[PDB]
């Protein structure tokens, strides 16, 4: 993934 | 505070000043002036009455269910009270009743036009074409 | 009282000319067709009154698509030349509305394609433009300002250490947050930077202004509410807290702030009070990218999915099934929603068909545009153009007026 989103894992 | 308006005829109304100073002529004739009664040379008393009944109960987005009712009249009436908004500058009044006419004429083809108003069709066939190619 | 009227003729008659104007200004322009040809005096008030001038003001007064035109095409220079000028002039912009409008639904336009030339990290994470600029955020942590019309570099701001990962900007100031985890303020005219804001403990990922106030949002799954007297004076308000994953996209009104996680949900708040109004279930994965207005929200998820909300009942309207991977960024204004994908394609929706429950799934995708190599990061549109960014270090223009 790019820096700009984050998903909701560890 | 009661204000008296005098219409043409001569009848006197007693209005809240409240109501009164909707019409900016008679705002200015009360407070630039100091005039009591107000004398409304150019609204008789059954427009006048017609008026009051308007602004008491305005104390207006495009036209409301009240509003409709209220302009069911005949053209010369709704005329009578576009003059009679204009020399009171009631711009609400002048408003609806303005946009009522717009109301009457879209839609319409020029000869429902016509028969709306009763307006006869005084354009030559040379100048009526002419009109009709550039539109 | 006179049964009939020809209210048209009798008002100038008695020196009300005006009025009569007034009233034949309401008529939209089939109508004032009509009134031209009902006899000779209604045409002269039209035709004195510049009927057709004012029909065209009032257009683009209350239309960015006429207003658009009028600055596009130059004939706003007579607005604010006789009558039948404007007359004449009055379908000429009808059709040409109608090319724009077949350009979009068939995908005709041309492209510009700006290099940004990124020496060792590549990409573009965020985007605003206008008809002067365009101002990027990019991965090589700088802040990149283009011509609008000559492509060319004007300035770069540095400062930043990490990736730019979102910016706005209004007439005064550029707001930006960073891989960094700050705020920074930059002079939009100068380049000067005028503040940094340390707050958040990761990266921020998402910021929106107006009106005095700033909402920020990070993947430290917080979102801040600041004030902003001026760009050196701005407060911390509030911290809002709920999400239980990163916070990747924030936005607002006066109504609600509406924020979106990887934790799968979007949360309303109060924007007066800050307090938690309602989350919005339903993405099966993370969500990437969010616009927020009036009443709808829409929303790209890691679902491969779009969901369009109505904020105060919190309903999802039409689920947008389309896009091959990830939904990284969206868009919408009255007419589409656009939006760009994981695998570089941008997708046009018609977005009054999709709010229509009686519109068919297959009817919703108006055209697939690709030209991307690389994940499309960022996007923002109007009437007659798409500006999009992306991985590929690319800042493309895609116009649909011709
Ligand atoms: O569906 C959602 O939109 C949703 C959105 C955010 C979070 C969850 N859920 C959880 O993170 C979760 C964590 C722990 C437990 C546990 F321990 F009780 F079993 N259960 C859970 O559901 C959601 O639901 C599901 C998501 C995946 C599969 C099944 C679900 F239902
Ligand atoms: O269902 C899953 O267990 C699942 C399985 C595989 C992958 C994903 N997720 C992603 O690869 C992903 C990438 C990016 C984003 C982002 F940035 F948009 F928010 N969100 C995402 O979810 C999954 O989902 C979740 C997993 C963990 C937490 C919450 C999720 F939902």
Redesign the interface.
Known sequence: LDSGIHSGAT | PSIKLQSSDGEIFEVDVEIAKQSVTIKTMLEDLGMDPVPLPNVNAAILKKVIQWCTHHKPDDIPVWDQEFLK????????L?LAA?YLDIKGL?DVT??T??NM??????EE??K????????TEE??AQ??K?? | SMLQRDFITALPARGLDHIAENILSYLDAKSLCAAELVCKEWYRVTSDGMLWKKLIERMVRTDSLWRGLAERRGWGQYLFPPNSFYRALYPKIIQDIETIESNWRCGRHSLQRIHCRSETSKGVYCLQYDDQKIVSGLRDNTIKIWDKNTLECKRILTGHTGSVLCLQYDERVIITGSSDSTVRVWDVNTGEMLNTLIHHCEAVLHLRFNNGMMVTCSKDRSIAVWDMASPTDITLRRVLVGHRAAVNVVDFDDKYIVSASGDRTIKVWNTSTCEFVRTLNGHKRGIACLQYRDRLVVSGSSDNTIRLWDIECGACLRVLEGHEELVRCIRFDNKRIVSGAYDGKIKVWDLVAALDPRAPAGTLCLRTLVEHSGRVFRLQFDEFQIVSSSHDDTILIWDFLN
């Open positions: 009249v005949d053209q010369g009436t709704l005329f009578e576009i204009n002048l303005c946009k006419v717009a004429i879209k839609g319409k083809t020029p036009i016509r709306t108003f009763n307006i006869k069709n005084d354009f100048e009526e009109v009709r550039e539109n």
